[PDB]
Subunit: 70 residues, 2 copies
C-alpha cells in the first residue's frame, strides 16, 4: 500500500471533488498498476495553550494494488 500525504499550510477551503478527481488522475498517470482506495481531507488544528491555533490541510490518498477481475 501507498500513503500519499499532501500538506497545504493555511485554512483556505479545498475543492473536495477536484481533489478526488486529481487524486484519481495522478494515480492513473504515475502509478498505473495501482488504484486509489481512499481519499481523506483533514482540517487539522493544533491547539496551543500559549498562543494561536495553527491550522493545516492534510490530503491523505491511500492507494493499493489493482485487483484484477479474475
Amino acid at each position: 500500500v501507498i500513503e500519499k500525504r499532501i500538506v497545504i499550510d493555511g485554512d483556505g477551503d479545498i475543492d473536495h471533488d477536484q481533489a478526488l478527481a486529481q487524486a484519481i488522475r495522478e494515480a492513473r498517470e504515475q502509478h498505473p498498476d495501482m488504484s486509489v482506495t481512499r481519499v481523506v481531507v483533514n482540517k487539522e488544528t493544533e491547539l496551543a495553550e500559549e498562543g494561536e491555533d495553527r491550522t493545516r490541510q492534510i490530503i491523505n490518498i491511500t492507494m493499493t494494488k489493482k485487483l484484477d477481475v479474475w
Copy 2:
C-alpha cells in the same frame, strides 16, 4: 512511553478548542499524573466519496509523553 489517545465524534458540531485542551489536560492530570500532554489536535476529517455524501468526523488526537520536570 508515548500515549496516543484518539477520540471520534461522528457529529460535525463545532468543537470548543479551549475546552478540548482543558479537558485533555484535566484527564491527563487525573489518570496519568506521571505524564504531560504535549500535543492536542482537532481534525475535521472528510472522507471523500465518489458515489454520494462525504461523511465527516471530528477526531481529537491527544499526544502525551513522559513528564519533563526536574525535582
